[PDB]
Each structure stands twice: as structure tokens, then as C-alpha cells.
Design an enzyme around this catalytic site. Structure first.
Site, mmCIF file in Angstrom:
data_model
loop_
_atom_site.group_PDB
_atom_site.id
_atom_site.type_symbol
_atom_site.label_atom_id
_atom_site.label_comp_id
_atom_site.label_asym_id
_atom_site.label_seq_id
_atom_site.Cartn_x
_atom_site.Cartn_y
_atom_site.Cartn_z
ATOM 1 N N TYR A 182 0.843 -1.198 0.000
ATOM 2 C CA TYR A 182 0.000 0.000 0.000
ATOM 3 C C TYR A 182 0.877 1.247 0.000
ATOM 4 O O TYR A 182 1.793 1.362 0.815
ATOM 5 C CB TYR A 182 -0.918 0.027 1.234
ATOM 6 C CG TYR A 182 -2.383 -0.166 0.898
ATOM 7 C CD1 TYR A 182 -3.092 0.803 0.185
ATOM 8 C CD2 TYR A 182 -3.057 -1.326 1.273
ATOM 9 C CE1 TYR A 182 -4.430 0.608 -0.139
ATOM 10 C CE2 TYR A 182 -4.380 -1.517 0.956
ATOM 11 C CZ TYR A 182 -5.060 -0.552 0.250
ATOM 12 O OH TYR A 182 -6.384 -0.752 -0.087
ATOM 13 N N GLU B 229 -0.448 4.820 -0.597
ATOM 14 C CA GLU B 229 -1.311 5.971 -0.833
ATOM 15 C C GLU B 229 -0.517 7.272 -0.819
ATOM 16 O O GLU B 229 0.348 7.482 0.031
ATOM 17 C CB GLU B 229 -2.415 6.033 0.214
ATOM 18 C CG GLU B 229 -3.504 5.002 -0.008
ATOM 19 C CD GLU B 229 -4.289 4.731 1.255
ATOM 20 O OE1 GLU B 229 -3.697 4.201 2.216
ATOM 21 O OE2 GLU B 229 -5.501 5.042 1.276
ATOM 22 N N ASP C 193 -7.730 11.791 -25.686
ATOM 23 C CA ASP C 193 -7.706 10.423 -25.195
ATOM 24 C C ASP C 193 -7.018 9.589 -26.271
ATOM 25 O O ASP C 193 -7.658 9.165 -27.237
ATOM 26 C CB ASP C 193 -9.125 9.935 -24.915
ATOM 27 C CG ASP C 193 -9.161 8.521 -24.383
ATOM 28 O OD1 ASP C 193 -8.117 7.831 -24.389
ATOM 29 O OD2 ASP C 193 -10.242 8.097 -23.924
ATOM 30 N N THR D 173 -4.806 4.619 -22.074
ATOM 31 C CA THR D 173 -4.490 3.284 -21.607
ATOM 32 C C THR D 173 -3.009 3.037 -21.815
ATOM 33 O O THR D 173 -2.320 3.798 -22.502
ATOM 34 C CB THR D 173 -5.277 2.246 -22.403
ATOM 35 O OG1 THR D 173 -5.073 2.498 -23.798
ATOM 36 C CG2 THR D 173 -6.737 2.346 -22.103
ATOM 37 N N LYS E 112 -3.229 -1.898 -25.338
ATOM 38 C CA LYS E 112 -3.549 -1.559 -26.730
ATOM 39 C C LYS E 112 -2.242 -1.312 -27.509
ATOM 40 O O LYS E 112 -1.309 -2.111 -27.352
ATOM 41 C CB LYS E 112 -4.509 -0.356 -26.826
ATOM 42 C CG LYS E 112 -5.753 -0.637 -25.971
ATOM 43 C CD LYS E 112 -6.811 0.456 -26.219
ATOM 44 C CE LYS E 112 -8.167 0.036 -25.618
ATOM 45 N NZ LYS E 112 -8.912 1.220 -25.207
ATOM 46 N N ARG F 226 -2.396 -3.497 -18.423
ATOM 47 C CA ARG F 226 -3.660 -2.764 -18.373
ATOM 48 C C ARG F 226 -3.556 -1.738 -17.253
ATOM 49 O O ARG F 226 -3.489 -2.095 -16.069
ATOM 50 C CB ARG F 226 -4.841 -3.716 -18.169
ATOM 51 C CG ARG F 226 -5.104 -4.577 -19.409
ATOM 52 C CD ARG F 226 -6.359 -5.427 -19.326
ATOM 53 N NE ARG F 226 -6.437 -6.259 -20.522
ATOM 54 C CZ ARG F 226 -7.116 -5.941 -21.616
ATOM 55 N NH1 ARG F 226 -7.973 -4.928 -21.629
ATOM 56 N NH2 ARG F 226 -6.916 -6.643 -22.729
#
Lengths: 472, 471, 472, 472
Positions: free
Chosen positions: D60, D62, D216, D242, D245, D251
Site C-alpha cells: 500500500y 497511498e 484520449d 491506456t 492496446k 492494463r
């Protein structure tokens, strides 16, 4: 010991408040001595005014007839029931299929209550663009994104426009925009459109996009009642209106709504009925308004009785005939009016072929007691100042003027714009230069004198010129 | 050929529309033959009514004086300017520190215009709970979640309440709630609260959460003007009001707002000034309203002149003295009124110890020409039916009544509640059974005759009883 | 010609990207040389990691099984169906009464998708206040009105709090607030609450106000699966969760929702069924997410099979027993923990009776390879800095530590706090001054060496310590 | 009495979960025995997969580097710092003028975070229409007004379209709609547009309405990195993407944003600097997401190093060359492709002249191991079913195919549509009747066999076909 009722409470205005009395008398003279061409203005009857100024103002009557919040409403209920039934009669509605709420304080309250009843906050609305002749209550935001109308503050609006060449509503572009935007509510009607509306096509478009269809008939409601304009009730779900303007009543609003079974529709249950009535009444009260203004409702009932007469239909015809006569006069002098005529109560005058703005003509006209207003022409919002003026027939027609009197108004207007051109030629187009011609202008003084002598010679509804304080 | 102007346009109402003329005449009689105890009701002057029914209705005047959309407003401007200056004078405002917009069509439009000016859609608002004596326009939603007031539709509202036991505003619970909820706008003022308001504490609480403070003084504006109630202008950013009710004018609204230099606050730029004026004016027009009702504005100017007099101050004192005399009379008979007294124009009568609901009393009273209204009591929103009634002194005090007369009203009210109890004894508590006692009741018939004889004996403002159709 | 497939595409990470390989190897060493006390952290299995890093990442599979946008999903559908049924099995759900969506990318997406499914923008929501132990995603705005959580940006939130004296949730004050505020959604569950939840009371409160009831069980999901915590499914309409933390899976989210017949209710039609399923699925896709992360879903299926074992229940029991052992140790040294105990996986340590901030203890602990985090205590938000730390047992329990090992962790924590006190004594309470004692500190160095020797003595799941690059 | 760590925690997937292991092996065989033509699909490297499946999942973290909420982040910080620097380098950004956030869990989270940072709820947004080649995240509502995308739920969207005759974006109609609608955010970029984008013109339009401009670049990001596509960073305020692709990574998502001094503009205060960085970081965390997925960030760092090689530029060139070769092949056989070519990685095939829907071709292709998808053509949404298919070159190019091999794919696709027509001829156009030809069809079995034999002849990144469970 309290000042007795007879002293503060029964003494006439002239003795209680001479200052305000004198100002109302100056306003009465001003209304007599000018040519009133503001298309939303009228002069209402003495009978309307007597109900407007009455003890009906003393009664709180929240709720509707039969469903009031408290008591003492026996006679308020009869008055409001009679007002509602006369409104449906004046607009030729079957009460089995149409109802009405006569509590809106004015036209803009009527529109916002209709939206509040029919829509959720942020739902999409389309109305006629303001520079194309729509009204602020139908939505308005500036190019800089500033939300001006509360309709654009609390809902999501997008305007449709007139054709920039012909001045008619571009119904095909509206259909295209509505298919893209998908409004929940499509509004028709406007404040400065010189032609009638194709409500059947608005219904076709609303049905394609799944929209409710509302007509705001404020400007033309007198012509609608007299069957001198296309009937919006044939096609619209809800009809809002002012009660002044061409209906010649007090200042108030009404919301009409369909009732009963819905017309056959695609894949939706048999026996479906409209459900507007409860939503609209509830939006007016308790949601938005407080106590009705019962003196306005009483005065409206009088106005609606007066409107549902052969005499009023003759008035409505004369209003139209007077607008045509004025438009034809202007065209005969080489002036250009949008769509080259009118089908209702107003004319839109294109001042660009004169090299003038409507701001200049409005300012000069106001200095010679002719009241009209600047207006964009052909839907344009790119011009620095509006290129036209809007001129309406209802008010002077109510003073008894007919076609030949409107042709004299046309010549006063031609004189005014000629003086306006004279100033612009001598001093220039800049407003601080143009203003130099508005002071110590003997031709302007003389046009004012001619206008006031003309206006002062016609009758006046609503008070007696023979008894007014300032008769010249 | 058009009908002559004189025919439709100058003929009197009695001739043009006998039906409506007759109904106004019946209503005129009803107003001066009953006991009007609805706390929001009053009887305004003939002078106000004459300005109200005037040719001012014929002028469109969108905008404000000096900045109108149309021409021809030279005298409308003088009237509206005079109305504004008289409003500031009546409420003892320095025009350098306060302005006013006098165009709102009524009290509820004034409030929604103020919210539109000061807030964004969905901003948080707190106001007195309707069962605690607040007004619908301060926010209202039901236990089922239904948003009733447009204030709760377009904004995010949360109510504060009176103390369950004492009937006073619970300022500690209000402050606790305001700290949790963080309203942008805190509203003070109400429609059925019988005590004065601690405006200084509202300002303390508003400052702790950084909220704007607005007072809706509609019910007490006449008392405020006459300096017979605490002054909300000392502490509030904005004051809204009706102009009828205790102010005794036409039906209209006003929005008052601060102007000029702000008082010190940490984190505030030196020299900061209030910025309410342009936002309030813009919200009224163009945002929300259309043409002003200039006949209302002229009539309001008359009412504000009448209010700013020694005579009106005597009236305001008498309204309070009559409310106290009535409350004292009921308490002398053993009845219970909320907070055991009043500091303003109204009294709240707790009917629960009698086994009576407010609607039973309101209905029986209406049948004997006494108009009051049922009212929740001690903030209660659980009870099936409201447990009290609200009674106001302004309207009957305007007909000249003093303490002894309001003690006679008290005896009429005692008789009415006794008759209500008598019917409940005989037919029962179910409203469908209770109603059987309201028909062919000779005691009820006599009380109505007594009330109407009583009411007939006093003068009436706004019209001449000696000229009315139904004597 | 292109670079050959085997070069870029088949070569190991160690050769393709030595820089990242080295950094992962340093992080692996950090994970098994420190004492991991962050209550949201765990160490997952090699089998989960093998599914996570697999060719499942190469498949786009928008939609759900039986209803994809693309073809080629035969084996993805089998994996997602397995994962869903294993989820229901792990939480003892009858599939006729419950369904689950396993596509949320993480816990916070799972929450926002649930709100999007169940609520309209601006609807009211209540959750546990962040300083009382709630999560940011349940709503958070500052005293200055700054909307911090997306939940408070797009919805209207109001928190409820723990009792300021006892540290327990104040259920009576919650009911009072909910009756006033009337949320459409009431959230239970939290991130820093040391006791179990009275779900029956939340359901009684939700029914009184007509709210939907949602449990975010992210922190305690492994305990819930093991039947070592009260079961939210007995009372909540919807349960959201992370799949890491105490459940010991990959980083992902799940949304469980009721299906089938509803319990009895007023004004509810006989035969009414829940209508959550289509809304929740649609909110995840197409509304909010894109392609599922199928390697996550495959790895989640592995973790759910691993969670539904006798051995996992023993682990969950051990997690609880270790938190109690640590809390007891601290209290026996005179330290104070909120509520004087725990019923779950974590402890809240109150540092204010020590004259310390949570910030100071967290910073010194970090420098000594002990990871925990500062935390408010007793719901306080008025303090400058948080006055406590949160400590959790899941991660070190996963490395095989039992009660006596957690008592040794307690003694390391005592040493750390004693060192923190010594540093504060020498260099001051101001943070900028305090930091001077964190450099060239011999006792700090020693505590770090002892912590790392301790940590290195335990096994480590997920990778082989005998093969890692940095063994010493 | 816990299960030993090595049992649940170190044991291989094949032993822990044979069911899931078996399904991943079936999916591995499916990936390298069919023809993958989904334009959003790719096959990533084993090196990426090794970072993706790693102990980075256990941490973790954050916050962002240098502003973390708690400790233990020494090496997470190095990884994320390296990831961000490699992202700016791969897209040729000056780090003084551009920043990036690499924590978005995927593309759709990246977009919604950018909207949350830049806009207020209900602000207006315009993006390419879904039937014209746009993405759901740019906005989508149905003709019935149903709001499908969260972008349309929480904001107010309006689409712009391609020219219905040419297939290119209609920049004139876009400018007209933006002037009317006045979006706060204009989005460029799309999912099924076969030509490059005129970003300079999008900036001209955005400047006319005062909108922010966002690109985008998800579908073309690998082309943009390789300088084989026009560069959106030259003109856009914010670029989202992304990382899978055409960029061939894991991903995940990224948000790039301008920093530093704003360019000169009328009415713009002197010395103005961009204000995106803090708003975007804060939107990602704490507003929307929770802990970053550090295994995705590490895998992304790997992919970005691989993308910034000369080898990757040759790949991107070959992707475009393969799409052109396939398009030319189809056109040489008489088929019609939208705009008669491509400038990027995909082709749009118009099936309408054949009397076919894309639905039928996609379903028959799926049955012979060819994955593509149906696609609307020329912006049409009036058809009962889409009239085209979308075919992409990135995935098969990554397995080593060049122009000659894409011409064999072209002949395979000709065979598939010929069989589709055969079924339609014999059974009919109703898909109910069409499905009758998809079972026990001998030509369909042979095409499947030919496709799978062809596919087995090529290499495969990400795993070793020589080690997989299900070989031929």
C-alpha cells in the site's frame, strides 16, 4: 390610543399620500400623451382595475378550491372556480380534457412553476433563442458561459433559431438540434416573432425526440382566445401565459394542462391518462408560491369575461389589421421589415439598410414620447448593437386607433428615423457623438409636440381623462 | 367596427361583471362580520387599495431605476425610488449600509430570489422546522423523503427545532447541527414562533461555520419597523419580508441587503465591501421575474409611509398588548399556551391536555365565523394531527380592538372549545363521527350569531361598510 | 525488419529491464526484513501471483459472462463464473439470494460503482466519519467545506461518529442524525474501528428512515469469510469489499447484492423481488469501467478458493488472537488502546498520555523498519496532528507469527516509543527539531538491526527467500 | 496450529488451483491459435508479465512520491518516479512543461479522474459520437435519453460526428455545435476512427469557446510514442491513455497534463501558469482511487522502456504498414473500406454493399477463430444493426506478421464473408435463420482449420509455446 380606522384606514390616497398620488397622476398623463408601441404593453379596463384594487387583497387562501389549508374561503373559492372556468371558456377548452391553475403571480412565475412540475433539476430544455425572438424564461446563457435566466441556472437549456435569411423559424434545424440534444421539454412561443407558429410540426418534433411540448402564448394570448391565431391547445401538453399583454387583463399568469386519456402512442399502455394536474398545482403551491393574490385572480376573471365577447374578437382583428397597416406603410416608404409583413400584433423593423442601430432609434423615439424597443434582426448575436426595433399594435388599438391612425404612427416613425439619420450624419456613429444631437434639437422638440398632440386626442380605458389631475 | 373605448374600458365593475362584483361584496361582508385570528392576516388601508388598483398596472418597467430595458419610466422610477427610500427609513437603515429591492411579487418570490442571488444549486441551507414554527420557503421535506418546498428541491436543506419541552428555539442544538451540516445559508425568522429571536446568537453560529445569515421577518415586520421587536438588521446579511401581514401593506415582498464596508473578520482583505446588491438585483431580474408590478410598488410606498408614523407604533404596541391579553385570558381559564406567553403578535394554544386536535377546533370555529388555524405544538412531528392552534392579533387590532375586546375574543374561543368538547363527548373522536355534531347544532348556531354581532360593532379599513351591498 | 519476437517478447525481466528487476528485488527484501503492521496490508500467495502475472492480461472481455461485446471469451467466461461462484461460497451466500460482480478494479471503484448503481447524483449518504475510523470513500468534507472524497463531490454526505469518551460507535446519535438527514444510503464498515458492528441495529435504523443499507467490509472480509466476525450479509442490501487486506487476495474489488424475493414491507407489492443485479452490473460496465482485468479476476478466484478452507479459518482466528495479544501487551506496559481491547484484526493506540503525536512514532518506526500509520483517536478532528497509531495483525500473522511473536513486536514498539521519547527530550517537540534526532542515532540503528534480524527469521509467502537477489 | 506458510503460500498455481491453472492454459492456447484482429487487443511481453505478477502487489502506497501518507515506500517511490520519467520520455515531453500521473487503474478511471479534476458536476463535455468511432467514456446517452456512460450521468455531454459521406470528422459541424453548446471540455481521440486527428484545428475550436482540450490517445498511444502519428501534446491541455492496446503494456492508465507558464492569450493575465497538476493528482487520490496497484506501475515502467526503443518504432511502422496492406488487399477484391484507406492501426470495412451486417460477420468469424468486432459505419445509428466491422493490426503484428501475412489474413477474411453470404443466401437475413448455417457447416470447419494452422506457424510473446500444456 390607536389612530381610528376612519383616519388611517378609510381616508383616500390623495390625502394619505399626496406624493404617490401626484406621481400616479403624472404617469396617467404620460400614458395619455405618448404613442405606446411596446408590443407587450396594453391598457386594461376600469372594471379590471376596480377588482384589482379591492378587499380581495386581505384574504390568505393557500391551497386550491376544495383543498384549502384553512377556512373562510367560501367566496374566494367561488371567485377562483369562476376564474378557472372562464379561462377554459375563453380558450375554448373542454374541461374534461384541460385544466388550469390561475394562481401564478405573473408570466415568469407561471413558466418556472410549469418547469418545476414537469422536470427534475438539470433536465434539458429547448426554447427559441433570445436574439431570434424568444423570452428570457425559455433559457438564456451568454457566449462567455454566464447563466442569465433562472431556467438556465436550474435546468440545462439550448436554444433554437430563426433562419438567418428569411426570419422564419428553421424547423428543420430545430428538429436536428432536438434529436441531438434530446430535451425533456420543448418550448414554443416567443416575444418578438412576427409570424404564427406551426404547432403541428412542433408536435411532430416533440414526438420524435420524446419531449413534452409547452407553448408560452403570453404575447399572442388575446389573438388565440379570439381565434385570430393558430390554436396551441390542439397540439401542446401545457400552455402557459401572462394575462396582460394582448389579453388586456391584470398582470398575472396561468398554466393550462391536459387531463384525461392520452392519445394513442407507441408501445405504451392502453387507458393511460395525463398526470399533469396534481404536479402543476403542487408546484405552484406548496412548492413555489405562498398565498394567492386574490385581487389579481378576481381581476383576471373580469378580464376573461371581457375577452370572451364578440367585441374582443373585433379588437383582436383590429390589432392584426393595425400591425399590417403599419408594416405596409413602412414598406411603402422603402423601409424593410423582417419577413416583409406580419401575421400577429407586431412588426420587426430592420434598420441595417439605413446604417442605424435600434439603440439610437429607441433613444430618440423615447425623447419624442414614442415608446418602442431595440431588437435583434434575423437571429443575429454578432452585431455590436441590435439592428432593428420591435413595434406592437395592442396598446394603441385599445385606445381606439384604426388603420389610418396607424399610418399616421408610421409617418411619425419615419420622421423619427429621419431625424436619427440627420444626427448620425452631422455628429457621427459613436454614441457620445450621437448624443450631441439629442439636446437642443428643435426638429426633435417639434416631433415630440406633434406626437403628444396626436396621442392626447384619443380616448383612454381604465380612468377618465376628463377627471385626471394633469389634463395637458 | 370596434366597441367604443368607454363601453368596455371605462364602465364600472358592477356593470361589466355583476357576478364578480357580487362575490367581492360577499367577501367584504365576510371580512367585517367574522373574528379574523389568522396570524398572517391583516386589513390594509383604502389608500393602499387605491394605489393598488391604478394605471400603474399598465407599464412594463423591467430593470431597476436608472437601468431600465425600456423607456418611458420617468415616473415609475420616481415611484420605485421613493418606495425604496421609504422602506429603508421605515426599518431605520442607513442607505450607505443597506439597500433594498422592492420588486419581488410576494414573500415566497423574495426568498427564492435571495437564495438564487446568494447560493449555487444544491448549496446547504438551514431554517426553522415547519413543525417548530418555520415557513415552507425555509425548506421542507417529509419523513418519506418527498421534497415539498422548492427550497428543498433546488437546494439542500436541514431544519433546526424548538426545544421539545419549553417551546423555545434550542440554540445549542442548532449550533451543533450547523457545525455538522455546514450550511452556506442560515435562515432565522418564522411563521408560528411566539418569542423574539436571539439574532446575536444566530450571528455567532453563522460565523462559526462561515454561513451567510438571512432573516425572514415576514410575520413580525410591522413590529420590527415600530421598534417593538429585536432588530434583525443589526446582525443579518440579508432581511427578506412580505409587505402585508403585520406591516399592513399590499401583498408584495422586499429583499434588504448590506452595502458598504464589511466589519472585521479574520482572513478578510482590508477594505472589503459587501457584494450583495448586484447579485440580488440580478436574481430578481433578469433571472427570475419579468416586469415588476408597479401598482404593488406604488401601494407598498403608501404602506411604508403609513408604517413610519407615531400612529403605527401605537398600533404595533397594541398588537402585542392584545396578544398578551388574549394569552393571559386563556391561561386564566386553565388553558395552556406554548412558552406560557408571547412576545409578539401571536399565541400558540396547546390543545392536547383537552383531548382535542387542532383541526376539530379550526373546523368548529370556521362554522361560527372565527378563522384561526391548527398548528403543531412543541415541534412535534409525530402526532397524527396537530395538537394546537395559532391565533394572531394584527387583523382584529386593525379594526380598533383593545385588550378588553381581545378578552371577549378569548371568551368566544373558550365557548368554541367547550362546544368542540361537547360534540367529541357525544359522537366521538373519529373525524367522520365528530362531523355529525356540526350539523343542526343550536349551540353552534348561537355562537355564530354572537360572534357576528360582536364583529359587526367595529370599524373596518379599506372600504366603507356604510356603502357595501350586503349589510 | 522488426525486432524478433523472442528478443523483446519472451526474454526475462532481469534481462529486459534490470533497473526495475533490481527495484522489485529490493522491495521483496524490504517486505521480509520489516515488521509490517499496516492494518490494510497482507502478503498474498505465490499461486495468486502466478495467476496475476499471466496471459489473462491480453484479453478484452467487456460485458459479463453470457453477454460480452466481443467473441473469444470462452475461457474468460469460465474463469469469471468460477470466481463469482467461489465468492458466494466463501461468504456463505445462497446464489438464489445473492449475486456478485467481481470486475471492480479495486475497493474504491467497487464503492463508487455501487453508489452509481443505487443512487442519483446528489442523493444523501451517511457513513462513518474518517476521524472516527471510516473510509474516505464513505464521504469526507473538511470543516472549511472542501469536498475531498468523490462521494462528497457527486453525492451529499453526512458522517456519524464514535462516542468521544468510549471509542464505540454512538448508535443512538446515528439514529438521531439519520432521522434528521434522511439518507438514501446508509453505509457501515470502516478502516480504523477496533470493534465489531451491530448490523441488526443498522438495519433497524435504515428501515426507520427508508435507506438502503450497504456494508463496506474491506478491512474485515477475511474475518467475515472465516465466520470470525458478525455477518453483514444477514442485514445489508449490498456488501462491497477489497480482495486484498485480510482476505489475502490480489488487489481488486467485489460488489455483492441481494437477489430474489424481498422481506415483508409496507406498500410493497406481493412477490416483489430485489432489483439490484442489473443496476450494479450496468454501473460497473458500461457506465464506469472498461475491459475487466482478467488476470486480477483469475488471481481472485485462486484467493477465494484459498480463503474457503479450514486452514484459512485457523489463520483468521490467529489474526484476532494476535491483535488481542499485542493490545494486552501494550496495556500491561501502561499504554492505552482505544476501547481497552479489540474484537478484530487491529489495535488503536492512544499516544496522547505519552506526550507524542502519531506522526512522530510513525516516522521513527519507519526508520527502524516497522511500518504502521498515525490515526486519530476517539473521533477527534480538532487536534493539530493525530494522537494515535493504527496497528494490524494480518500481514505478520501470514508469515506465521503467533501470540508470543506479537508480544515481541510489542516490545519492539515499546523500544520505539521509548526512543521517540528520548529524541523528543533531546531535540524538542517541534517536528522540524525532532527530525534532528533521526540521523546518526546509535540506538535507532540498533533497533533497526534487531527488527530486521527478527523479521528475517520467519517464512515469507509469495516468493522464495532462498532465491531472491538480496538475501542479507 | 496454522497451515505452514509454504503450503498455502509458496506452492505453485498448478498445485494450488488446477482448475484455474487449466483454464489459463486453455486461454494461452486460444491466444496463439487464432487470428486476433480486435484493434484494442495486443500481446504484451513476458518481462511486463513478470513485473505484473510480483510482490509489488503487497504494498500500500497511498499518496505520490514525496507526499505519501505513511512509510515503507523507499522502493515504491523509485519505481513510480522511474515510471513517470519513462512516460514523459516515451512521449517526448519536457518535464518542465508536462507532468504525468501513472496511478489510474485503467483507461476509463484515467478519464473520469481527469473530468473530476478539471470540471464541476454537470459541466458540459463534447466527444466523438460512439457510432462515429468514439469511446463510451467520452459520453453516451440513448435516443430514449437513457444515460449510459458515467460521463453522461455526472456531466452534460453532446457528441460530434463524422461526415456521413466521407467518413472523416466533420470539423465544421463540430465547431458549429461547440459554439452553440459551449462545452467546458472538448475531447478528441477515438476507438474506431481510421484517420489521424487535426489537433491544431481542435485547439482553434476549443479556443473559440473557452473550452479545455483533452486528447484520449488510448488506441494510438504506441503510434504517438513512436512518432508515427500526429502529436496531441503539441495542442492539448491534458492527454489520457491506456497503457495496453498499441503501447503493448499492462492494463493501466495515465494522465498527462501541462505545467509551467501558459502561452500568450488575449485577456489572459501576464505570468499565468498552468494549474492542472495538483487538481489531477488530487482527483486520482484521495478523491477517486485508493492504494495504487504498484505491480501495474512496475509493469508499466517496463513497457515504457520497451516502447522508447528503435525496435518499437519499427513495430509501429509495421503496424501501420500491415493495416494498409490489409486494407489494400480488401479493396483489391472489391470490398469497400471507410475513407478508402487508413493512416493508423485499424481499418473499417463497410459491409453494406454486400447486404451484410457486422453482427453476422463477427459471429461467423468467431466460429473460425478470427476475432474482430462489428462497427457502425459513416456515423450511422439508424440501422437495425451495424453495417461494418473494425479490424486492427497491433496484436498479430506483435506475433511477427508482416505485409504478406496480413494479405493472407485478408484472404481469410474474404473467405469468411463469402461463407457468411452463402449462409444468408440459403437461410435468409433474419439472424434467427442465419444461425441455421453456423452448425454442422463443413466449409466453416475447414476455414477454422486453415486459420488455426496459419496461426500456429507464428511466434508468440509473453509465454513460451514450447512449454504450454495444450500444444498441437
Amino acid at each position: 390610543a390607536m389612530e381610528p380606522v376612519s383616519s388611517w384606514g378609510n381616508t383616500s390616497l390623495v390625502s394619505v399620500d399626496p406624493e404617490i398620488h401626484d406621481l400616479i397622476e403624472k404617469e396617467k398623463r404620460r400614458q395619455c400623451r405618448g404613442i405606446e408601441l411596446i408590443a407587450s404593453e396594453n391598457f386594461t379596463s376600469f372594471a379590471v382595475i376596480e377588482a384589482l384594487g379591492s378587499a380581495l387583497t386581505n384574504k390568505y387562501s393557500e391551497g386550491i378550491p376544495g383543498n384549502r389549508y384553512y377556512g373562510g374561503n367560501e367566496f374566494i373559492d367561488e371567485i377562483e372556480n369562476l376564474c378557472r372556468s372562464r379561462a377554459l371558456e375563453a380558450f375554448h377548452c373542454d374541461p374534461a380534457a384541460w385544466g388550469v391553475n390561475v394562481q401564478p403571480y405573473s408570466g415568469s412565475p407561471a413558466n418556472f412553476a410549469a418547469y418545476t412540475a414537469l422536470l427534475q433539476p438539470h433536465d434539458r430544455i429547448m426554447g427559441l433563442d433570445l436574439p431570434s425572438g424568444g423570452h428570457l424564461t425559455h433559457g438564456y446563457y451568454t457566449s462567455g458561459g454566464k447563466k442569465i435566466s433562472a431556467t438556465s441556472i436550474y435546468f440545462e437549456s439550448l436554444p433554437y433559431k430563426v433562419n438567418f435569411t428569411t426570419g422564419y423559424i428553421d424547423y428543420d434545424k430545430l428538429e436536428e438540434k432536438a434529436l441531438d440534444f434530446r430535451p425533456k421539454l420543448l418550448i414554443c412561443g416567443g416575444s418578438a416573432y412576427p409570424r404564427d407558429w406551426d404547432y403541428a410540426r412542433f408536435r411532430a418534433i416533440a414526438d420524435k425526440v420524446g419531449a413534452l411540448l409547452l407553448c408560452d402564448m403570453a404575447h399572442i394570448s388575446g389573438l388565440v382566445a379570439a381565434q385570430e391565431a393558430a390554436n396551441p391547445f390542439e397540439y401542446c401538453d401545457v400552455v402557459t401565459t401572462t394575462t396582460h399583454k394582448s389579453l388586456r387583463g391584470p398582470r398575472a399568469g396561468m398554466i393550462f394542462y391536459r387531463k384525461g386519456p392520452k392519445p394513442p402512442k407507441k408501445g405504451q399502455p392502453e387507458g393511460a391518462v395525463y398526470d399533469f394536474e396534481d404536479k402543476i398545482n403542487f408546484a405552484v403551491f406548496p412548492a413555489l408560491q405562498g398565498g394567492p393574490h386574490n385581487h389579481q385572480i378576481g381581476a383576471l376573471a373580469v378580464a376573461l369575461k371581457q375577452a370572451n365577447t364578440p367585441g374582443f374578437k373585433v379588437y383582436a382583428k383590429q390589432v392584426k389589421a393595425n400591425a399590417v397597416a403599419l408594416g405596409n406603410y413602412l414598406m411603402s416608404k422603402g423601409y424593410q421589415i423582417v419577413t416583409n409583413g406580419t401575421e400577429n400584433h407586431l412588426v420587426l423593423w430592420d434598420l441595417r439598410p439605413l446604417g442605424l442601430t435600434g439603440n439610437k432609434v429607441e433613444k430618440l423615439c423615447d425623447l419624442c414620447s414614442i415608446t418602442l424597443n431595440k431588437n435583434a434582426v434575423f437571429g443575429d448575436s454578432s452585431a455590436l448593437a441590435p439592428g432593428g426595433v420591435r413595434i406592437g399594435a395592442p396598446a394603441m388599438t385599445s385606445r381606439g386607433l384604426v388603420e389610418k391612425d396607424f399610418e399616421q404612427i408610421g409617418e411619425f416613425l419615419s420622421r423619427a428615423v429621419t431625424l436619427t439619420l440627420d444626427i448620425q450624419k452631422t455628429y457621427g456613429k459613436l454614441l457620445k457623438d450621437f448624443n450631441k444631437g439629442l439636446v437642443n434639437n428643435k426638429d426633435l422638440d417639434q416631433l415630440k409636440a406633434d406626437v403628444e398632440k396626436f396621442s392626447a386626442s384619443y380616448e383612454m380605458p381604465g380612468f377618465l381623462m376628463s377627471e385626471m389631475k394633469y389634463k395637458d
